[PDB]
Amino acid sequence: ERRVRELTEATNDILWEFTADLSEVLVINSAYEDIWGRSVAKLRENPHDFLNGIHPEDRELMKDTMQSLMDGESADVECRVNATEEYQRWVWIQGEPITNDAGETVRVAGFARDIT
Helix, strand or coil: CHHHHHHHCCCCCEEEEEECCCCCEEEECCHHHHHHCCCHHHHHHCHHHHHHHECHHHHHHHHHHHHHHHCCCCEEEEEEECHHHCCCEEEEEEEEEEECCCCCEEEEEEEEEECC
């Protein structure tokens, strides 16, 4: 059923990864620009910039998401994005923690898919 879904519309997921303190973007692809309505260049210079593209109500859900990741759990959230389009896009985000030698979450990584 997944393949047939993919025939109907080619997948174009955002692939992302940040350091856990959001000091840097480690992975971001060009799909980010159309969906978020913001530049990858700006994100690299300020890794917190993606938050400005998230509806202000879903911004606090993101705090809960980061906390889950820091507790070593995977997370799965849906939120409204793209400030230029009055946040009319919905995105499905799934993230996982990448840990250091001591089991601490030091990077967070996943995908984001435009689900309308």
